[PDB]
Amino acid sequence: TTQLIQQVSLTDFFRPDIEHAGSIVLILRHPSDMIGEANTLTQAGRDPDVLLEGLRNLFNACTAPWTVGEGGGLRAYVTSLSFIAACRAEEYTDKQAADANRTAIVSAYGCSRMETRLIRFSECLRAMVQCHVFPHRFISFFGSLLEYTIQDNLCNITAVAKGPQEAARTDKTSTRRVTANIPACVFWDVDKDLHLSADGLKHVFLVFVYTQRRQREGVRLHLALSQLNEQCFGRGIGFLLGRIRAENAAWGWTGDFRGLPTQLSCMYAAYTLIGTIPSESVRYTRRMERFGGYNVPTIWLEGVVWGGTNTWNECY
Amino acid sequence: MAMPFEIEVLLPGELSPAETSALQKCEGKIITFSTLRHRASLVDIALSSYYINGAPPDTLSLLEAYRMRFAAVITRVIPGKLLAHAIGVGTPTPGLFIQNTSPVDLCNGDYICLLPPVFGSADSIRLDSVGLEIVFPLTIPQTLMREIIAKVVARAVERTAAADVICYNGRRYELETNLQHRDGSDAAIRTLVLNLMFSINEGCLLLLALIPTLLVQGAHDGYVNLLIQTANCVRETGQLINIPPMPRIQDGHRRFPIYETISSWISTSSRLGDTLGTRAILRVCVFDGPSTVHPGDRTAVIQV
Amino acid sequence: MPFEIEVLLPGELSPAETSALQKCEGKIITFSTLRHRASLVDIALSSYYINGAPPDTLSLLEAYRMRFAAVITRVIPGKLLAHAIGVGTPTPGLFIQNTSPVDLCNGDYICLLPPVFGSADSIRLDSVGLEIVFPLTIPQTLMREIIAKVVARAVERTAAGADVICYNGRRYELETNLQHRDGSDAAIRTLVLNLMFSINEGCLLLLALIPTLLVQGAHDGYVNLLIPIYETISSWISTSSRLGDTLGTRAILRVCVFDGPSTVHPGDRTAVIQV
Amino acid sequence: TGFHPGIAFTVVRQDRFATEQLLYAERASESYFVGQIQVHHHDAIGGV
């Protein structure tokens, strides 16, 4: 049939009592790797200690600060996609929905010091894209939330990692099944931009966007839905992001190969294939929905078959 | 979705028994589709769909069509309809099989790539009652297709600025490519040069002063002698170019240049050929059949 | 339904050897062809032998892409069973005994890499006169880095006239103690050579086409340009492409634990599904 | 600028009107054979 996955993590960056089933969950690597990675990947004339400060000041005020070092057996593993969306709600073009998302998730979680945690995470992402350690290399697609069990400051998630979505029987309130849903601020579809607007199969991509201009970093991600394959999808987005590519490549006998555009200086986006919709034509509904006490708009997909082989395709 | 993505291509009721027998003689050949529906039409696998600007295309344009589309395999044809299984979208696909349409063999285990028909005349089936040509993409192993793509992109660059034989397993097959216009050419050359640029980096200077070490090794060892003389550049520079003492690298105690100049080349190299050409979607895995496969025998495969 | 492979271990096995083959529960082997009856002289190292002597690292990276891998399930004192991964949907609990310097988190995609470290996988079946090397099961994320660092070290070593790799909060050093680094330097030279030759041929071909690349300003013109020579371009692509597809190594497996331990220290066994 | 450049054209344009046809037939003009109704399953949004 399908395939489930399980993970126990803390509940600092994610609370399944607040996410609804069908929300995408993301997994993180250990933050300790960033130290050595930035130690060997930072650009000459730039000090990665700003990344160190970002990480250190982030993890100083998120949860129990201890244990996050090497001896970590329990960790902050999973984060919600809506979380990583609402901490960067200042770059999504459809402002009003993203702003509703942000205020809702600031009010729905613990209530205390999340404004703190949010800007901590925003500053951390800014710093990493500034020291040429990209977020796409550390954040992967875990699954779609199916069922959970929580305790004091610790959770136990089980999510769908492969196969059709609605073939997963869960003990919910309304009906034994559940469908996928994403916040309406990250939903960007490549097809209508390029105007091919055809029915049939559509892939679902998870695409990041990088704008590295000095002291003006920028990181945001969307969930693409296009007809293109994984080969020419890079061409398509590279096309309708011309200004970012330009301002990134321009401002990112002795040979003297100094100050030339390198691959990390010219990078602007990276994407992955995560599923597909083998239906007759895709229907989706943007209905306003409640996260506990607040109302935020979402996208309700139908018939998504999660895929795999989590390999990132880069675009410089 | 638990079965392979079946496809129901329809034949008009006005097709001659001769053409239906011809179709019977092509079960197991590969076709493509513009979009991926479930009730397709015969028009969408004919040459009337491979038209750029209202004309039959060239070897470069078709080479872009073959990856701008989706692929399928003709399992069996019937008077009612035509059946085909999608390849690289819905994972489950058991016992699939292909027909080898190529002037070379098919070794067990190699990966399969598909080309536009270049070698000689194509095995084109002309359906006259509807007026549709049907040409089937080739079936070429991956290690060989690269030589063809290189030798065709060279001809493209040459035609734009200002050999057609390839040896494989001791056999000479002539290349009859054509480019009746000019925009696909530079559309390819721009990618060529773009990916050519992002290879050079800081550590290339250190990699350059290592040319004379490569020369003295070319004198010292034997396979280095096979490697050095096909390189139409290194054999000249290390004998006619010099690089003085490299200056110290800015913040030389933290970063490391060679790591970058060699890591940003693994990425840019794998994706190279899959941009000037196509990727490999299928790999011949004969379980209990013959050892190799002659031109025109039915194979057994699993998708990449 | 699942594909099944039998390997009939012969007699004359020293019980001190079978005692170690009993430890080979969950290691990966490869065949050149998929059958049901497999002879022990097919997974032995003596099968590769691409050019006489034992294969290189380039030779092994080229093998791992053409052969069909199969994981060794339970072994009994008589014979050895194995299930082919890649096709067949193995219904049993297809576990993997990770053999890698670094850990394995929950939910990684695992690829293969020849023993480019302190090789100790070899089980030395002397009584029969053949030996079997297993591959390293590394995560897909460390795949682009390990190759790059191990080749950069050698390309600096030939440039005679803290290099640690980190993952999941653990650090594994690459600087082997002995500065008498023969042997492994020899089983890696045709890679550093074949790679180096490609990059130099690319650089000295780029600069030989456009006469306004660096002479119109390495910052002003080079970037503004960004926004039989004709049998050499061919010679460059026709080799750079074969190298790239060799170092691709698409994943084959994925570690998905379900109510167990969330980390796989080297030498433990865990459940794995196929991709 | 309104100067006549010594040439003339014949503009052409085509128009598509929606009309209501009126159809007539004779008695027993065609034989309409009908075959056998067959079924086949196929996977979907999760069911059949």
JSON list of N, CA and C in Angstrom, two decimals, chain A residues 39-44 46 48 164 199-201 203 227 229-232 235 253-254 256-258 262-263 266 276 278 280 314 316, chain B residues 1 5 35-38 64 67-68 70 89 198 200-202 204-205 242-244 249-250 254-256 264 267-268 271 274-275 279:
[
{"chain": "A", "resi": 39, "resn": "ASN", "atom": "N", "xyz": [33.51, 26.64, 8.27]},
{"chain": "A", "resi": 39, "resn": "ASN", "atom": "CA", "xyz": [34.94, 26.82, 8.46]},
{"chain": "A", "resi": 39, "resn": "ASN", "atom": "C", "xyz": [35.75, 26.61, 7.19]},
{"chain": "A", "resi": 40, "resn": "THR", "atom": "N", "xyz": [35.24, 25.79, 6.28]},
{"chain": "A", "resi": 40, "resn": "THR", "atom": "CA", "xyz": [35.95, 25.46, 5.05]},
{"chain": "A", "resi": 40, "resn": "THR", "atom": "C", "xyz": [35.26, 25.98, 3.78]},
{"chain": "A", "resi": 41, "resn": "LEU", "atom": "N", "xyz": [34.10, 26.62, 3.93]},
{"chain": "A", "resi": 41, "resn": "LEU", "atom": "CA", "xyz": [33.32, 27.00, 2.75]},
{"chain": "A", "resi": 41, "resn": "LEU", "atom": "C", "xyz": [33.07, 28.50, 2.71]},
{"chain": "A", "resi": 42, "resn": "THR", "atom": "N", "xyz": [33.44, 29.25, 3.74]},
{"chain": "A", "resi": 42, "resn": "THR", "atom": "CA", "xyz": [33.21, 30.68, 3.73]},
{"chain": "A", "resi": 42, "resn": "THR", "atom": "C", "xyz": [34.12, 31.39, 2.74]},
{"chain": "A", "resi": 43, "resn": "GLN", "atom": "N", "xyz": [33.67, 32.54, 2.28]},
{"chain": "A", "resi": 43, "resn": "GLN", "atom": "CA", "xyz": [34.44, 33.26, 1.29]},
{"chain": "A", "resi": 43, "resn": "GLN", "atom": "C", "xyz": [35.56, 34.05, 1.93]},
{"chain": "A", "resi": 44, "resn": "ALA", "atom": "N", "xyz": [36.63, 34.24, 1.16]},
{"chain": "A", "resi": 44, "resn": "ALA", "atom": "CA", "xyz": [37.83, 34.89, 1.67]},
{"chain": "A", "resi": 44, "resn": "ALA", "atom": "C", "xyz": [37.48, 36.35, 1.90]},
{"chain": "A", "resi": 46, "resn": "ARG", "atom": "N", "xyz": [35.76, 37.19, 4.60]},
{"chain": "A", "resi": 46, "resn": "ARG", "atom": "CA", "xyz": [34.53, 37.16, 5.37]},
{"chain": "A", "resi": 46, "resn": "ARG", "atom": "C", "xyz": [34.68, 36.17, 6.51]},
{"chain": "A", "resi": 48, "resn": "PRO", "atom": "N", "xyz": [33.18, 33.70, 9.33]},
{"chain": "A", "resi": 48, "resn": "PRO", "atom": "CA", "xyz": [31.96, 32.94, 9.63]},
{"chain": "A", "resi": 48, "resn": "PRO", "atom": "C", "xyz": [31.52, 33.01, 11.09]},
{"chain": "A", "resi": 164, "resn": "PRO", "atom": "N", "xyz": [0.26, 6.58, -2.15]},
{"chain": "A", "resi": 164, "resn": "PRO", "atom": "CA", "xyz": [-0.88, 7.50, -2.20]},
{"chain": "A", "resi": 164, "resn": "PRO", "atom": "C", "xyz": [-1.18, 8.08, -0.83]},
{"chain": "A", "resi": 199, "resn": "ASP", "atom": "N", "xyz": [-4.07, 19.99, -18.52]},
{"chain": "A", "resi": 199, "resn": "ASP", "atom": "CA", "xyz": [-4.45, 18.98, -17.55]},
{"chain": "A", "resi": 199, "resn": "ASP", "atom": "C", "xyz": [-3.43, 17.86, -17.57]},
{"chain": "A", "resi": 200, "resn": "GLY", "atom": "N", "xyz": [-3.58, 16.91, -16.66]},
{"chain": "A", "resi": 200, "resn": "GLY", "atom": "CA", "xyz": [-2.76, 15.73, -16.68]},
{"chain": "A", "resi": 200, "resn": "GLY", "atom": "C", "xyz": [-1.85, 15.66, -15.47]},
{"chain": "A", "resi": 201, "resn": "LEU", "atom": "N", "xyz": [-0.75, 14.93, -15.64]},
{"chain": "A", "resi": 201, "resn": "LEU", "atom": "CA", "xyz": [0.16, 14.71, -14.54]},
{"chain": "A", "resi": 201, "resn": "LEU", "atom": "C", "xyz": [0.87, 16.01, -14.17]},
{"chain": "A", "resi": 203, "resn": "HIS", "atom": "N", "xyz": [3.99, 17.31, -11.26]},
{"chain": "A", "resi": 203, "resn": "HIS", "atom": "CA", "xyz": [4.90, 17.04, -10.17]},
{"chain": "A", "resi": 203, "resn": "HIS", "atom": "C", "xyz": [4.71, 18.08, -9.08]},
{"chain": "A", "resi": 227, "resn": "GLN", "atom": "N", "xyz": [3.74, 21.06, -14.62]},
{"chain": "A", "resi": 227, "resn": "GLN", "atom": "CA", "xyz": [3.76, 19.98, -15.60]},
{"chain": "A", "resi": 227, "resn": "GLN", "atom": "C", "xyz": [5.16, 19.56, -16.01]},
{"chain": "A", "resi": 229, "resn": "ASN", "atom": "N", "xyz": [9.08, 18.36, -16.19]},
{"chain": "A", "resi": 229, "resn": "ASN", "atom": "CA", "xyz": [9.84, 17.31, -15.54]},
{"chain": "A", "resi": 229, "resn": "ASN", "atom": "C", "xyz": [10.94, 17.92, -14.68]},
{"chain": "A", "resi": 230, "resn": "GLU", "atom": "N", "xyz": [11.72, 17.06, -14.02]},
{"chain": "A", "resi": 230, "resn": "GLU", "atom": "CA", "xyz": [12.79, 17.55, -13.17]},
{"chain": "A", "resi": 230, "resn": "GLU", "atom": "C", "xyz": [13.94, 18.11, -13.98]},
{"chain": "A", "resi": 231, "resn": "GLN", "atom": "N", "xyz": [14.00, 17.82, -15.27]},
{"chain": "A", "resi": 231, "resn": "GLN", "atom": "CA", "xyz": [15.08, 18.34, -16.10]},
{"chain": "A", "resi": 231, "resn": "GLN", "atom": "C", "xyz": [14.87, 19.81, -16.45]},
{"chain": "A", "resi": 232, "resn": "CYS", "atom": "N", "xyz": [13.74, 20.14, -17.08]},
{"chain": "A", "resi": 232, "resn": "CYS", "atom": "CA", "xyz": [13.51, 21.48, -17.58]},
{"chain": "A", "resi": 232, "resn": "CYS", "atom": "C", "xyz": [12.84, 22.40, -16.57]},
{"chain": "A", "resi": 235, "resn": "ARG", "atom": "N", "xyz": [15.16, 25.22, -15.85]},
{"chain": "A", "resi": 235, "resn": "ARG", "atom": "CA", "xyz": [15.11, 26.25, -16.88]},
{"chain": "A", "resi": 235, "resn": "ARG", "atom": "C", "xyz": [13.91, 27.17, -16.67]},
{"chain": "A", "resi": 253, "resn": "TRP", "atom": "N", "xyz": [52.83, 35.15, -17.86]},
{"chain": "A", "resi": 253, "resn": "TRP", "atom": "CA", "xyz": [51.41, 35.43, -17.66]},
{"chain": "A", "resi": 253, "resn": "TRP", "atom": "C", "xyz": [50.92, 34.82, -16.35]},
{"chain": "A", "resi": 254, "resn": "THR", "atom": "N", "xyz": [50.29, 35.65, -15.53]},
{"chain": "A", "resi": 254, "resn": "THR", "atom": "CA", "xyz": [49.71, 35.22, -14.27]},
{"chain": "A", "resi": 254, "resn": "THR", "atom": "C", "xyz": [48.19, 35.16, -14.43]},
{"chain": "A", "resi": 256, "resn": "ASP", "atom": "N", "xyz": [45.47, 34.97, -12.28]},
{"chain": "A", "resi": 256, "resn": "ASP", "atom": "CA", "xyz": [44.66, 35.88, -11.46]},
{"chain": "A", "resi": 256, "resn": "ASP", "atom": "C", "xyz": [43.17, 35.59, -11.62]},
{"chain": "A", "resi": 257, "resn": "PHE", "atom": "N", "xyz": [42.78, 34.40, -11.18]},
{"chain": "A", "resi": 257, "resn": "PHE", "atom": "CA", "xyz": [41.37, 33.99, -11.16]},
{"chain": "A", "resi": 257, "resn": "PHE", "atom": "C", "xyz": [40.75, 34.40, -9.82]},
{"chain": "A", "resi": 258, "resn": "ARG", "atom": "N", "xyz": [40.83, 35.70, -9.54]},
{"chain": "A", "resi": 258, "resn": "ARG", "atom": "CA", "xyz": [40.37, 36.26, -8.28]},
{"chain": "A", "resi": 258, "resn": "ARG", "atom": "C", "xyz": [39.15, 37.14, -8.53]},
{"chain": "A", "resi": 262, "resn": "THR", "atom": "N", "xyz": [31.75, 32.62, -8.73]},
{"chain": "A", "resi": 262, "resn": "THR", "atom": "CA", "xyz": [31.79, 31.21, -8.41]},
{"chain": "A", "resi": 262, "resn": "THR", "atom": "C", "xyz": [30.38, 30.65, -8.30]},
{"chain": "A", "resi": 263, "resn": "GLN", "atom": "N", "xyz": [30.30, 29.32, -8.16]},
{"chain": "A", "resi": 263, "resn": "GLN", "atom": "CA", "xyz": [29.01, 28.66, -8.14]},
{"chain": "A", "resi": 263, "resn": "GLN", "atom": "C", "xyz": [28.15, 29.02, -6.93]},
{"chain": "A", "resi": 266, "resn": "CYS", "atom": "N", "xyz": [26.86, 32.59, -7.41]},
{"chain": "A", "resi": 266, "resn": "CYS", "atom": "CA", "xyz": [25.89, 32.77, -8.48]},
{"chain": "A", "resi": 266, "resn": "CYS", "atom": "C", "xyz": [24.61, 31.96, -8.27]},
{"chain": "A", "resi": 276, "resn": "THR", "atom": "N", "xyz": [3.84, 13.52, -6.86]},
{"chain": "A", "resi": 276, "resn": "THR", "atom": "CA", "xyz": [3.21, 13.66, -8.16]},
{"chain": "A", "resi": 276, "resn": "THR", "atom": "C", "xyz": [1.71, 13.54, -7.99]},
{"chain": "A", "resi": 278, "resn": "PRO", "atom": "N", "xyz": [-1.06, 11.93, -10.24]},
{"chain": "A", "resi": 278, "resn": "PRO", "atom": "CA", "xyz": [-1.51, 11.25, -11.47]},
{"chain": "A", "resi": 278, "resn": "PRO", "atom": "C", "xyz": [-3.02, 11.18, -11.60]},
{"chain": "A", "resi": 280, "resn": "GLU", "atom": "N", "xyz": [-6.70, 13.14, -13.50]},
{"chain": "A", "resi": 280, "resn": "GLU", "atom": "CA", "xyz": [-7.15, 13.64, -14.79]},
{"chain": "A", "resi": 280, "resn": "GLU", "atom": "C", "xyz": [-6.91, 15.12, -15.06]},
{"chain": "A", "resi": 314, "resn": "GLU", "atom": "N", "xyz": [20.39, 22.07, -8.38]},
{"chain": "A", "resi": 314, "resn": "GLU", "atom": "CA", "xyz": [20.79, 23.44, -8.13]},
{"chain": "A", "resi": 314, "resn": "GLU", "atom": "C", "xyz": [20.66, 24.29, -9.39]},
{"chain": "A", "resi": 316, "resn": "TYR", "atom": "N", "xyz": [22.38, 27.85, -10.76]},
{"chain": "A", "resi": 316, "resn": "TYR", "atom": "CA", "xyz": [23.21, 29.04, -10.74]},
{"chain": "A", "resi": 316, "resn": "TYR", "atom": "C", "xyz": [23.42, 29.57, -12.15]},
{"chain": "B", "resi": 1, "resn": "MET", "atom": "N", "xyz": [-2.95, 4.97, -6.69]},
{"chain": "B", "resi": 1, "resn": "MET", "atom": "CA", "xyz": [-2.15, 4.43, -7.79]},
{"chain": "B", "resi": 1, "resn": "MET", "atom": "C", "xyz": [-1.23, 3.29, -7.30]},
{"chain": "B", "resi": 5, "resn": "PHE", "atom": "N", "xyz": [1.02, 3.29, -14.98]},
{"chain": "B", "resi": 5, "resn": "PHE", "atom": "CA", "xyz": [0.14, 4.27, -15.61]},
{"chain": "B", "resi": 5, "resn": "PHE", "atom": "C", "xyz": [-0.18, 3.80, -17.03]},
{"chain": "B", "resi": 35, "resn": "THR", "atom": "N", "xyz": [1.57, 15.89, -23.28]},
{"chain": "B", "resi": 35, "resn": "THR", "atom": "CA", "xyz": [1.13, 15.83, -21.90]},
{"chain": "B", "resi": 35, "resn": "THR", "atom": "C", "xyz": [0.78, 14.39, -21.56]},
{"chain": "B", "resi": 36, "resn": "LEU", "atom": "N", "xyz": [0.47, 14.15, -20.30]},
{"chain": "B", "resi": 36, "resn": "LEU", "atom": "CA", "xyz": [0.19, 12.80, -19.82]},
{"chain": "B", "resi": 36, "resn": "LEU", "atom": "C", "xyz": [-1.28, 12.72, -19.40]},
{"chain": "B", "resi": 37, "resn": "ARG", "atom": "N", "xyz": [-2.14, 12.39, -20.35]},
{"chain": "B", "resi": 37, "resn": "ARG", "atom": "CA", "xyz": [-3.53, 12.08, -20.06]},
{"chain": "B", "resi": 37, "resn": "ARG", "atom": "C", "xyz": [-3.65, 10.58, -19.80]},
{"chain": "B", "resi": 38, "resn": "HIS", "atom": "N", "xyz": [-4.88, 10.07, -19.81]},
{"chain": "B", "resi": 38, "resn": "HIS", "atom": "CA", "xyz": [-5.11, 8.64, -19.82]},
{"chain": "B", "resi": 38, "resn": "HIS", "atom": "C", "xyz": [-5.80, 8.15, -21.08]},
{"chain": "B", "resi": 64, "resn": "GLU", "atom": "N", "xyz": [15.67, 18.16, -27.89]},
{"chain": "B", "resi": 64, "resn": "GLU", "atom": "CA", "xyz": [14.97, 18.85, -26.82]},
{"chain": "B", "resi": 64, "resn": "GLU", "atom": "C", "xyz": [13.57, 18.32, -26.60]},
{"chain": "B", "resi": 67, "resn": "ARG", "atom": "N", "xyz": [13.27, 15.18, -24.21]},
{"chain": "B", "resi": 67, "resn": "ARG", "atom": "CA", "xyz": [13.29, 15.36, -22.77]},
{"chain": "B", "resi": 67, "resn": "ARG", "atom": "C", "xyz": [12.27, 16.37, -22.29]},
{"chain": "B", "resi": 68, "resn": "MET", "atom": "N", "xyz": [11.66, 17.13, -23.19]},
{"chain": "B", "resi": 68, "resn": "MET", "atom": "CA", "xyz": [10.52, 17.96, -22.83]},
{"chain": "B", "resi": 68, "resn": "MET", "atom": "C", "xyz": [9.22, 17.17, -22.78]},
{"chain": "B", "resi": 70, "resn": "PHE", "atom": "N", "xyz": [7.13, 13.08, -22.12]},
{"chain": "B", "resi": 70, "resn": "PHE", "atom": "CA", "xyz": [7.09, 11.88, -21.31]},
{"chain": "B", "resi": 70, "resn": "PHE", "atom": "C", "xyz": [7.17, 10.66, -22.22]},
{"chain": "B", "resi": 89, "resn": "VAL", "atom": "N", "xyz": [7.19, 8.16, -14.19]},
{"chain": "B", "resi": 89, "resn": "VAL", "atom": "CA", "xyz": [6.33, 8.99, -13.35]},
{"chain": "B", "resi": 89, "resn": "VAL", "atom": "C", "xyz": [5.73, 8.17, -12.22]},
{"chain": "B", "resi": 198, "resn": "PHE", "atom": "N", "xyz": [31.79, 27.94, -15.30]},
{"chain": "B", "resi": 198, "resn": "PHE", "atom": "CA", "xyz": [31.73, 27.74, -13.87]},
{"chain": "B", "resi": 198, "resn": "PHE", "atom": "C", "xyz": [32.62, 26.65, -13.40]},
{"chain": "B", "resi": 200, "resn": "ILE", "atom": "N", "xyz": [36.25, 26.69, -13.87]},
{"chain": "B", "resi": 200, "resn": "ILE", "atom": "CA", "xyz": [37.49, 27.30, -13.40]},
{"chain": "B", "resi": 200, "resn": "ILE", "atom": "C", "xyz": [37.23, 28.03, -12.09]},
{"chain": "B", "resi": 201, "resn": "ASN", "atom": "N", "xyz": [38.22, 27.99, -11.20]},
{"chain": "B", "resi": 201, "resn": "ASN", "atom": "CA", "xyz": [38.06, 28.57, -9.88]},
{"chain": "B", "resi": 201, "resn": "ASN", "atom": "C", "xyz": [39.44, 29.02, -9.39]},
{"chain": "B", "resi": 202, "resn": "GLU", "atom": "N", "xyz": [39.55, 29.25, -8.08]},
{"chain": "B", "resi": 202, "resn": "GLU", "atom": "CA", "xyz": [40.81, 29.71, -7.51]},
{"chain": "B", "resi": 202, "resn": "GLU", "atom": "C", "xyz": [41.91, 28.67, -7.70]},
{"chain": "B", "resi": 204, "resn": "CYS", "atom": "N", "xyz": [42.52, 26.50, -9.70]},
{"chain": "B", "resi": 204, "resn": "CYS", "atom": "CA", "xyz": [42.97, 26.17, -11.04]},
{"chain": "B", "resi": 204, "resn": "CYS", "atom": "C", "xyz": [44.40, 26.64, -11.27]},
{"chain": "B", "resi": 205, "resn": "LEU", "atom": "N", "xyz": [44.83, 27.70, -10.58]},
{"chain": "B", "resi": 205, "resn": "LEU", "atom": "CA", "xyz": [46.21, 28.15, -10.69]},
{"chain": "B", "resi": 205, "resn": "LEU", "atom": "C", "xyz": [47.18, 27.10, -10.17]},
{"chain": "B", "resi": 242, "resn": "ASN", "atom": "N", "xyz": [53.82, 29.21, -19.13]},
{"chain": "B", "resi": 242, "resn": "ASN", "atom": "CA", "xyz": [54.37, 29.13, -17.79]},
{"chain": "B", "resi": 242, "resn": "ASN", "atom": "C", "xyz": [53.50, 29.95, -16.86]},
{"chain": "B", "resi": 243, "resn": "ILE", "atom": "N", "xyz": [53.51, 29.58, -15.58]},
{"chain": "B", "resi": 243, "resn": "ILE", "atom": "CA", "xyz": [52.78, 30.29, -14.54]},
{"chain": "B", "resi": 243, "resn": "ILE", "atom": "C", "xyz": [53.75, 30.62, -13.41]},
{"chain": "B", "resi": 244, "resn": "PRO", "atom": "N", "xyz": [53.94, 31.89, -13.07]},
{"chain": "B", "resi": 244, "resn": "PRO", "atom": "CA", "xyz": [54.93, 32.26, -12.05]},
{"chain": "B", "resi": 244, "resn": "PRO", "atom": "C", "xyz": [54.48, 31.83, -10.66]},
{"chain": "B", "resi": 249, "resn": "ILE", "atom": "N", "xyz": [46.88, 33.08, -1.03]},
{"chain": "B", "resi": 249, "resn": "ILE", "atom": "CA", "xyz": [45.43, 33.19, -1.08]},
{"chain": "B", "resi": 249, "resn": "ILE", "atom": "C", "xyz": [44.93, 33.96, 0.13]},
{"chain": "B", "resi": 250, "resn": "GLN", "atom": "N", "xyz": [43.99, 34.87, -0.10]},
{"chain": "B", "resi": 250, "resn": "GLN", "atom": "CA", "xyz": [43.47, 35.73, 0.95]},
{"chain": "B", "resi": 250, "resn": "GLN", "atom": "C", "xyz": [42.77, 34.89, 2.01]},
{"chain": "B", "resi": 254, "resn": "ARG", "atom": "N", "xyz": [42.05, 29.58, 6.73]},
{"chain": "B", "resi": 254, "resn": "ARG", "atom": "CA", "xyz": [40.71, 29.10, 7.02]},
{"chain": "B", "resi": 254, "resn": "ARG", "atom": "C", "xyz": [40.08, 28.35, 5.85]},
{"chain": "B", "resi": 255, "resn": "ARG", "atom": "N", "xyz": [40.08, 28.93, 4.66]},
{"chain": "B", "resi": 255, "resn": "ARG", "atom": "CA", "xyz": [39.43, 28.32, 3.51]},
{"chain": "B", "resi": 255, "resn": "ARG", "atom": "C", "xyz": [40.41, 27.40, 2.79]},
{"chain": "B", "resi": 256, "resn": "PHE", "atom": "N", "xyz": [39.91, 26.70, 1.77]},
{"chain": "B", "resi": 256, "resn": "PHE", "atom": "CA", "xyz": [40.72, 25.77, 1.00]},
{"chain": "B", "resi": 256, "resn": "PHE", "atom": "C", "xyz": [40.26, 25.76, -0.46]},
{"chain": "B", "resi": 264, "resn": "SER", "atom": "N", "xyz": [32.90, 21.76, -7.11]},
{"chain": "B", "resi": 264, "resn": "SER", "atom": "CA", "xyz": [32.05, 22.41, -8.08]},
{"chain": "B", "resi": 264, "resn": "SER", "atom": "C", "xyz": [32.27, 21.90, -9.49]},
{"chain": "B", "resi": 267, "resn": "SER", "atom": "N", "xyz": [29.58, 18.31, -9.62]},
{"chain": "B", "resi": 267, "resn": "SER", "atom": "CA", "xyz": [28.20, 18.69, -9.89]},
{"chain": "B", "resi": 267, "resn": "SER", "atom": "C", "xyz": [28.03, 19.11, -11.34]},
{"chain": "B", "resi": 268, "resn": "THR", "atom": "N", "xyz": [28.81, 20.09, -11.78]},
{"chain": "B", "resi": 268, "resn": "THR", "atom": "CA", "xyz": [28.66, 20.63, -13.13]},
{"chain": "B", "resi": 268, "resn": "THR", "atom": "C", "xyz": [28.98, 19.60, -14.22]},
{"chain": "B", "resi": 271, "resn": "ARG", "atom": "N", "xyz": [25.63, 16.75, -14.62]},
{"chain": "B", "resi": 271, "resn": "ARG", "atom": "CA", "xyz": [24.49, 17.38, -15.26]},
{"chain": "B", "resi": 271, "resn": "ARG", "atom": "C", "xyz": [24.80, 17.91, -16.65]},
{"chain": "B", "resi": 274, "resn": "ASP", "atom": "N", "xyz": [23.46, 15.49, -19.58]},
{"chain": "B", "resi": 274, "resn": "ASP", "atom": "CA", "xyz": [22.01, 15.42, -19.50]},
{"chain": "B", "resi": 274, "resn": "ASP", "atom": "C", "xyz": [21.34, 16.73, -19.87]},
{"chain": "B", "resi": 275, "resn": "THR", "atom": "N", "xyz": [22.12, 17.74, -20.23]},
{"chain": "B", "resi": 275, "resn": "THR", "atom": "CA", "xyz": [21.58, 19.00, -20.72]},
{"chain": "B", "resi": 275, "resn": "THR", "atom": "C", "xyz": [21.79, 19.17, -22.22]},
{"chain": "B", "resi": 279, "resn": "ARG", "atom": "N", "xyz": [18.93, 12.05, -20.33]},
{"chain": "B", "resi": 279, "resn": "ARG", "atom": "CA", "xyz": [19.35, 11.14, -19.27]},
{"chain": "B", "resi": 279, "resn": "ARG", "atom": "C", "xyz": [19.04, 9.70, -19.68]}
]
